[PDB]
């Protein structure tokens, strides 16, 4: 049971937020509607299918919420030290659905789902740029 202006995916609810934050600013803000709630992690393709419906918004509606404009921060990040990509919300990697090219792979430490597939793919941006977000509250 999502609230308004939520909608539910496995294990909880997705926000879609078109305020434009940077990643840290962005997963701080998802944090803050409690234990739980961090910028969506996207543990497999049915996930994105959902995920990609939400915010291409190409027909549905609930009461006061439209679809993303541009790219959409989503919970991975590569802290600065560390190598490998990580969830913000604890998950351990298991799906990923990276941009396939070299250059969507680098310049930034920071992932948004791309507008340019209707948010089939993501690609890694600096952290301090400004975008939408979403978060996923879970239960």
Same mark, same amino acid.
């Given at each position: 049971?999502?609230?308004?202006?939520?909608?539910?995916?496995?294990?909880?609810?997705?926000?879609?937020?078109?305020?434009?934050?940077?990643?840290?600013?962005?997963?701080?803000?998802?944090?803050?509607?409690?234990?739980?709630?961090?910028?969506? %992690?996207?543990?497999?393709?049915?996930?994105?299918?959902?995920?990609?419906?939400?915010?291409?918004?190409?027909?549905?509606?609930?009461?006061?919420?439209?679809?993303?404009?541009?790219?959409?921060?989503?919970?991975?990040?590569?802290?600065?030290?560390?190598?490998?990509?990580?969830?913000?919300?604890?998950?351990?990697?298991?799906?990923a659905?990276w941009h396939?090219?070299?250059? %969507?792979?680098?310049?930034?430490?920071?992932?948004?789902?791309?507008?340019?597939?209707?948010?089939?793919?993501? %690609?890694?941006?600096?952290?301090?740029?400004?975008?939408?977000?979403?978060?996923?509250? %879970?239960?």
């Open positions: 049971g999502c609230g308004p202006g939520w909608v539910p995916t496995p294990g909880g609810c997705l926000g879609f937020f078109s305020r434009e934050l940077s990643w840290s600013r962005a997963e701080s803000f998802c944090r803050r509607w409690g234990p739980g709630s961090h910028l969506a %992690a996207v543990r497999s393709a049915a996930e994105l299918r959902l995920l990609a419906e939400l915010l291409n918004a190409s027909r549905g509606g609930d009461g006061s919420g439209e679809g993303a404009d541009g790219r959409v921060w989503i919970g991975l990040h590569r802290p600065a030290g560390s190598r490998s990509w990580r969830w913000s919300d604890g998950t351990a990697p298991r799906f659905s396939r090219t070299a250059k %969507a792979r680098r310049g930034g430490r920071c992932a948004a789902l791309r507008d340019e597939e209707a948010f089939t793919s993501w %690609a890694a941006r600096p952290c301090t740029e400004r975008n939408a977000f979403v978060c996923k509250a %879970a239960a």
